[PDB]
């Protein structure tokens, strides 16, 4: 590696060298560059509509909201900072964007700030039997922000309820909505409750004047789910400028490669995106962004 | 919801051959001055093809198969063809994809759709006053997933009879999920409904569906001045698609131009 005639002394493996010519190496350009396109992130889902939502259901009547065909930029929530926690379970929040699933739901209500302590997996309680159960394998996300300030009522909201008795325990994101009367002994309690029977649902005390503990939390639960069908929702991807006229690697929308890329006299159809030689080998492509 | 057109009363299936007619673009690849192979599902030059005609009582609505994929040939005056069913059982048990043009825009949905007997996008006093607008194709529909708007246009609602001078050739395939669309349209002169000579058919939608689909369905509309409505003139065809073998002649600016049966 000292100078060329050293080089071509090991090649023919020889400490003299008679006249000629020689090939010893091979010259290759190094990618100086990366280049990194994708389309535009139009049409996204309204994410903030729940986070940010004029009206919230009750916890035994959760409402919940199907997010597909859209691309969802988790990241917004992590660094916004207009929660009072978050926490989820299996991805971290700041790695969401990275994957891609095939159905996701937003199971919003309103809770105690004791209360939060029961969403999870493996927990029991009030709310985690009675109101809004999850399962053990639940790898989604729940954020909460404190709504002390936008949904406390002097007297109490009565329009947020919740259930404290059932007859039996909920499945995982099972929903029920009825007034039976809860029995406890054998007489039948004729639509009333009293002795051995309770009207299992009641309203919340969200006063102005509540605790940490007893204040109003916007909460919701986004669980994710990865099915047999395709993939209907994703991350954004990152992109940068368009390099010209130097080797790098491509790294396109759904194409990679390495070469030099400059500007052509090619006409493509509208719904052309990418093209190929004779030996189906990529020669030209379509910027994602511009046309 | 369960009247049907009692003026309805259903022909023989004629058949009558596809001479070069049916051929798509199998991907989006640019190609200039060559000849490739592709084998995928295409449809065999010169086969049979299924003649249907809807006009007041020849007036043709069944159901038909979706095993492999089929086709159109949506040549009419009045506007009759404003969209099409697809699914297995066609009501609230399974899903099914609906697709529908009202006239004024394009609209793809998916729902549990427990479609009527006889459905149909029909309209009603279209002497004064018509805009150009609809004016129930099934009963109940709830928990469905997927919604779409393409571009609007404008739909001739009228009723009218006579010759045809226009072609709108459709292919419909379920890639893996993915219920993949192409289209062409093109000037024509009638002579049995099925005008010849080639044509590719560029694509026009990807659908990320994934319902698993065996039979579909026309939606002719009916128009009077569901049980004793009216209908213009109107005919379509019906392919069923293959695994075949093609070749692919590409000029210089990537259209095809011609193609071979191997």
Same mark, same amino acid.
């Given at each position: 590696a000292l100078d060329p005639l050293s080089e071509t002394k090991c090649t023919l493996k020889s400490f003299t060298v008679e006249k000629g010519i020689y090939q010893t190496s091979n010259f290759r350009v190094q990618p100086t560059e990366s280049i990194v396109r994708f389309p535009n992130i139009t049409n996204l889902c309204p994410f903030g509509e729940v986070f940010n939502a004029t009206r919230f259901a009750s916890v035994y009547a959760w409402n919940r909201k199907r997010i597909s065909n859209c691309v969802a930029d988790y990241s917004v929530l992590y660094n916004s900072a207009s929660f009072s926690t978050f926490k989820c379970y299996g991805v971290s929040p700041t790695k969401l964007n990275d994957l891609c699933f095939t159905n996701v739901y937003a199971d919003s209500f309103v809770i105690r700030g004791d209360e939060v302590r029961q969403i999870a997996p493996g927990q029991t309680g009030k709310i985690a039997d009675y109101n809004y159960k999850l399962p053990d394998d639940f790898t989604g996300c729940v954020i909460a922000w404190n709504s002390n300030n936008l949904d406390s009522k002097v007297g109490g909201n009565y329009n947020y309820r919740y259930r404290l008795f059932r007859k039996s325990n909920l499945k995982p994101f099972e929903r029920d909505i009825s007034t039976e009367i809860y029995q406890? !002994?054998?007489? =039948?309690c004729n639509g009333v409750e009293g002795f051995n029977c309770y009207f299992p649902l009641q309203s919340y005390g969200f006063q102005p004047t509540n605790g940490v503990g007893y204040q109003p939390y916007r909460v919701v639960v986004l669980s994710f789910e990865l099915l047999?069908? =395709?993939? %209907?929702v994703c991350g954004p991807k990152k992109s940068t400028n368009l390099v010209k006229n130097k080797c790098v690697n491509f790294n396109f929308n759904g194409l990679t490669g390495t070469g030099v890329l400059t500007e052509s006299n090619k006409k493509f159809l509208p719904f052309q995106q990418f093209g190929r030689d004779?030996? /189906? %080998? %990529? /020669?030209a492509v379509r910027d994602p962004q511009t046309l | 919801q369960c009247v049907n057109l009692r003026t309805r009363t259903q022909l023989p299936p004629a058949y009558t051959n596809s001479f070069t007619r049916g051929v798509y673009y199998p991907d989006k690849v640019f190609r200039s001055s060559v000849l490739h192979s592709t084998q995928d599902l295409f449809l065999p030059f010169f086969s049979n093809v299924t003649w249907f005609h809807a006009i007041h009582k020849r007036f043709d609505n069944p159901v038909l198969p979706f095993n492999d994929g089929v086709y159109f040939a949506s040549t009419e005056k009045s506007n009759i063809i404003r969209g099409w069913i697809f699914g297995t059982t066609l009501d609230s048990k399974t899903q099914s994809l609906l697709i529908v043009n009202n006239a004024t825009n394009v609209v793809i949905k998916v729902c549990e759709f427990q479609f009527c007997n006889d459905p149909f996008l029909g309209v009603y006093y279209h002497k004064n006053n018509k805009s150009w607008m609809e004016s129930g194709v099934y009963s109940s529909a709830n928990n469905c997933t997927f919604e779409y708007v393409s571009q609007p246009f404008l739909m001739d609602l009228e009723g009218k009879q006579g010759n045809f001078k226009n072609l709108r050739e459709f292919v419909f395939k379920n890639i893996d999920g993915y219920f993949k669309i192409y289209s062409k349209h093109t000037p024509i002169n009638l002579v049995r409904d099925l005008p010849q000579g080639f044509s590719a058919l560029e694509p026009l939608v990807d659908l990320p569906i994934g319902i698993n689909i065996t039979r579909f369905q026309t939606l002719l509309a009916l128009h009077r001045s569901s049980s004793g409505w009216t209908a213009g003139a109107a005919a379509y065809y019906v392919g069923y698609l293959q695994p075949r073998t093609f070749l692919l002649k590409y000029n210089?600016? !990537? %259209?095809?131009?011609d193609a071979v049966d191997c």
């Open positions: 406890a !002994g054998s007489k =039948p047999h069908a =395709p993939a %209907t004779i030996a /189906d %080998t %990529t /020669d | 210089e600016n !990537g %259209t095809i131009t």
